[PDB]
Write a structure and sequence with these properties.
Chain lengths: 63, 159
């Protein structure tokens, strides 16, 4: 497991969702250092954009 | 993205131990104005990278409140209190979104994390999280985030 999880790892994320009925999709990719506890992500809305609500309700779901 | 939480040696890193199979989670967020967000996620490891699939349903936000009107300004520092229960790892948070009007908008959050195979559960401890939007285009169809997360014992003294 300390083999299979490297000191640097990347990830891919797909979100499908709706807020107050507004459907949307988000595709993203990130990277970080699992054992140091740090990471970055870049997300793009792919359907349903622009979004009528605060991005802040989505951020903890990515992270 | 729970695979990236820094843990002390004497606390089992539940999320890392779940791999390569990985884990799932389900989260409920209750906001002070009646807004609700329910989220489920599946985390796995394929082709040497983590793969995340998320579904999100947000309902009952006042069409006139800070979320629908895009009036929030980021999350404060977060402390997620972890504890084992019913074969799974739960996290509870009481946490606020900053508001453009010099104000706060509070949320209670509970998440259940379950590994797809048997993994040792930790006892109670805290995960401290800093979550930042580092940049975005004008309309947030492109956004970049930074997160730092670290488990800390909540009992055990100076030891």
């Amino acid at each position: 497991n300390m083999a299979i999880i490297k000191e640097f790892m990347r990830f891919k994320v797909h979100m499908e969702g709706s807020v107050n009925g507004h459907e949307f999709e988000i595709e993203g990719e990130g990277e970080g250092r699992p054992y140091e506890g740090t990471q970055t992500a870049k997300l793009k809305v792919t359907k349903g954009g622009p979004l009528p609500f605060a991005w802040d309700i989505l951020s903890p779901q990515f992270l | 993205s729970r695979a990236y939480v820094k843990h002390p040696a004497d606390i089992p890193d539940y999320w890392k131990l779940s791999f390569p199979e990985g884990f799932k989670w389900e989260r409920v967020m209750n906001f002070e104005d009646g807004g609700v967000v329910t989220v489920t996620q599946d985390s796995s490891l394929q082709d040497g990278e983590f793969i995340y699939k998320v579904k999100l349903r947000g309902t009952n936000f006042p069409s006139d409140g800070p979320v629908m009107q895009k009036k929030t300004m980021g999350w404060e520092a977060i402390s997620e209190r972890m504890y084992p229960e019913d074969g799974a790892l739960k996290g509870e948070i009481k946490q606020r979104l900053k508001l453009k009007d010099g104000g706060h908008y509070d949320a209670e959050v509970k998440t259940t994390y379950k590994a797809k195979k048997p993994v040792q559960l930790p006892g109670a401890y805290n995960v401290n999280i800093k979550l930042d939007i580092t940049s975005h285009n004008e309309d947030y169809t492109i956004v970049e985030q930074y997160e730092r997360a670290e488990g800390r014992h909540s009992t055990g003294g100076m030891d």
